[PDB]
């Protein structure tokens, strides 16, 4: 079969007279979770994934900006052009959504352990919804995801392009907490520690390295997310300062932010989270280095962050 | 196949002001970083400057630096120099090439140049 | 900082010509070889040291190593006659820089 792009339509487990956002929108917008999805599993089969390349990472997209729209307004709009609107200070909690497809159609999911995030897998498995993903809207480091069951997971359409950002799923759940922030320094060590061994599998033994990034709007060069609403920027050099053969990360909150629903500038008004780190998106540094290279954090892209979710699923059409 | 044409030059009084466009064709530009090069009239080649892919970053030598101001724009597929005060040692060839990828990387594609010449 | 390599390679047709590049820099960063024909813009020939992009003459060669880079050209013909460079980087890989041109020409 060949997959098409069709109009999925989201199962949320929200509450309507709750008064948190994404439980607001996702009531009108999604329906409530099958209390079992049946998992129809196919062992003979195999197909191909290409996770650059899936209509579901639009979609998604589409959606988050629609409740960011629809809930969250900005104080004022600069997008080549002047808006002035309200500021309700709004409650920002991300819950599971799932996605699920129409009748006559179906979800192919990879249950392959290890996957690459291109090419084709085994054990393929067909269902009618999606697991539960979390829209966190953050940047540098992924929280709130779903972590790789075994070992690490590194993915890019092509290592060898360093423009192409890199996503990471971890081998396990890094506490970070932040009200400033913090976050215990040895679990991150440990996770470099793997992050190493696999690059290190990946780029013929040359040693590796870390380091922040270099330039930048603020929102790229600093761990930028929401928390109750409201715009958090942190500082990662601390994360970033040892290279491989408690940390208290410092934060700002300034509401002069750059949308990423657009190429624009919008602010809100001032002011009146503990989460998991379960992905992380990188850049690599090509340069000239005989052993040594180096990669940075980056990111900006939210299909980036979409992806890390829907590598595995991909929309079929059947009988 | 790759196709990188330079335009701006030709001849100027001293102090006067200058800029240099470089189109291109046949490679993702938006995914990669450019270099300018420089060479005198029978003389060997010099490294004028660098920019990436997204110009977040930018490089200029130190001969040249504090005049020249390198840019580009990707919806047009164009890279840009600009010469603030035109000294006569100014005066070569300007070559325009691309990068290996989209920071700081070889100079792999070389598009013949544009004469510059600073005659009192 | 500085890469210096000779201004001046004779060559007999068919013999190996060689071409060096020192520079303190070459430790810990890689060499890049460039060729110039008269009349025409400059060429890749060689990236990275050793690695060569198919398809160009296999008898252009690179050996890197220490301190010094070395072009090797594999039986010269008088069409190999040109000005060839090595460029990279200073220690800290924000700037490129040139070497002083070396002309392999055929003896007359």
């Known amino acids: 079969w060949k997959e098409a792009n069709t109009t999925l339509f989201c199962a949320s487990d929200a509450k309507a007279y709750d008064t948190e956002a994404h439980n607001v929108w996702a009531t009108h917008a999604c329906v409530p979770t099958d209390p079992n999805p049946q998992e129809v599993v196919l062992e003979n089969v195999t197909e191909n994934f290409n996770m650059w390349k899936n209509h579901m990472v639009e979609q998604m997209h589409e959606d988050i900006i629609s409740l960011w729209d629809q809930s969250l307004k900005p104080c004022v709009k600069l997008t080549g052009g002047v808006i002035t609107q309200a500021c309700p200070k709004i409650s920002f909690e991300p819950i599971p959504i799932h996605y699920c497809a129409p009748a006559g159609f179906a979800i192919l999911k990879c249950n392959d352990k290890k996957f690459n995030g291109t090419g084709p897998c085994t054990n393929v498995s067909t269902v009618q919804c999606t697991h539960g993903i979390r829209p966190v809207v953050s940047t540098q480091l992924l929280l709130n995801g779903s972590l790789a069951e075994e070992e690490v997971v590194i993915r890019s359409e092509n290592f060898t392009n360093n423009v192409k950002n890199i996503i990471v799923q971890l081998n396990e759940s890094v506490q970070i907490n932040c009200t400033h922030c913090n976050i215990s320094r040895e679990k991150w060590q440990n996770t470099l520690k793997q992050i190493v061994k696999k690059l290190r599998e990946q780029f013929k033994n040359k040693t590796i390295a870390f380091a922040p990034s270099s330039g930048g709007d603020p929102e790229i060069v600093m761990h930028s997310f929401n928390c109750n609403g409201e715009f958090f920027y942190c500082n990662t050099t601390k994360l970033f300062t040892s290279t491989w053969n408690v940390i208290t990360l410092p934060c700002r909150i300034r509401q002069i932010i750059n949308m990423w629903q657009e190429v624009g500038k919008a602010m809100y008004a001032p002011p009146i989270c503990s989460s998991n780190i379960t992905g992380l998106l990188l850049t690599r540094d090509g340069g000239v280095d005989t052993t040594k290279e180096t990669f940075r954090p980056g990111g900006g892209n939210m299909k980036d962050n979409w992806r890390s979710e829907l590598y595995k699923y991909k929309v079929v059409r059947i009988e | 196949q790759v196709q990188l044409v330079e335009s701006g030059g030709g001849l100027f009084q001293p102090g006067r002001s200058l800029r240099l466009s470089c189109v291109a064709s046949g490679f993702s530009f938006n995914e990669k970083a450019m270099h300018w090069v420089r060479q005198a009239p029978g003389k060997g080649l010099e490294w004028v400057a660098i920019?990436?892919?997204?110009?977040?970053?930018?490089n200029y030598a130190d001969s040249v630096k504090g005049r020249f101001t390198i840019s580009r724009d990707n919806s047009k597929n164009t890279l840009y120099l600009q010469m603030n005060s035109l000294r006569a040692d100014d005066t070569a060839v300007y070559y325009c090439a691309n990068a290996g990828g989209g920071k700081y990387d070889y100079l792999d594609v070389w598009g013949r140049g544009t004469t510059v010449t600073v005659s009192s | 900082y500085e890469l210096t390599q000779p201004p001046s390679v004779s060559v007999s047709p068919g013999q190996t010509a060689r071409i060096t590049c020192s520079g303190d820099?070459?430790?810990?960063?890689?060499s890049y070889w460039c060729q110039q024909k008269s009349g025409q813009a400059p060429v890749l020939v060689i990236y990275?040291?050793?690695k060569r992009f198919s398809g160009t003459p296999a008898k252009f060669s690179g050996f890197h190593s220490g301190t010094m880079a070395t072009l090797t050209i594999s039986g010269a013909q008088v069409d190999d006659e040109a000005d060839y460079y090595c460029?990279?980087?200073?220690?800290?890989?924000?700037?490129?820089?040139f070497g002083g041109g070396t002309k392999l020409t055929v003896l007359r």
């Open positions: 460029f990279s980087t200073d220690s800290s890989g924000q700037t490129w820089v």
């Open positions: 920019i990436w892919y997204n110009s977040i970053h930018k």
């Open positions: 820099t070459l430790s810990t960063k890689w």
């Open positions: 990275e040291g050793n």
